Design a protein around this ligand. Structure first.
Ligand code: SR
Ligand code: SR
Lengths: 144, 39
């Protein structure tokens, strides 16, 4: 599934968690990196992650388990690029937001004649009080 | 040397773990309330 280069690249990332170069990621290494990035995992969350990811049962994430953790991201790279391209179809001015005027232009392109009021309402249903739709909301919308 | 890609992959891995933990904890809580409700 993975090339020699893909393995190498993940190994470098893995090595950044592994502060003492022991060949695995401890609960303290995991908690430290996550906290330094502002993710504030609780102890119960860290304990759960070690249990779920290190199926070897040593409370130390090995490289093979790190790869299995990240493999879905590789499987999903094409979908992520498509999502961004689809968002760009709406977002003509490229400011990372979809407005009602941009939604209207797509609607017209595909032969859907809606009043401006209906376009406003269409956008409002999925915007969160906002006048525009951002990439997060675009993705959330497609999560059913 | 150290590349942007390497840093980005560390960040992605951390974000994925945070999300997994959040949703596992949230699933465990909801299964517990339903366990009680079932008696
Ligand atoms: Sr270590
Ligand atoms: Sr825009």
């Amino acid at each position: 599934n993975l090339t020699e280069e893909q393995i190498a690249e993940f190994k470098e990332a893995f090595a950044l968690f592994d502060k003492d170069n022991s060949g695995s990621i401890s609960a303290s290494e995991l908690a430290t990196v996550m906290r330094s990035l502002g993710l504030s995992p609780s102890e119960a969350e860290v304990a759960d992650l070690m249990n779920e990811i290190d199926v070897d049962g040593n409370h130390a994430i090995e490289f093979s388990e790190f790869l299995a953790l990240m493999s879905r991201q590789l499987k999903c790279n094409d979908s992520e690029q498509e999502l961004l391209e689809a968002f760009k179809v709406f977002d003509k001015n490229g400011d990372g937001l979809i407005s009602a005027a941009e939604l209207k232009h797509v609607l017209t392109s595909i032969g859907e004649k809606l009043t401006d009021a209906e376009v406003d309402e269409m956008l409002r249903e999925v915007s969160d009080g906002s006048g525009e739709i951002n990439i997060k909301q675009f993705a959330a919308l497609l999560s059913k | 040397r150290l590349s942007f890609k390497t840093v980005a992959l560390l960040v992605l891995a951390c974000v994925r773990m945070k999300r997994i933990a959040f949703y596992r904890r949230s699933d465990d809580n909801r299964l517990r309330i339903l366990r009680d409700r079932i008696e």
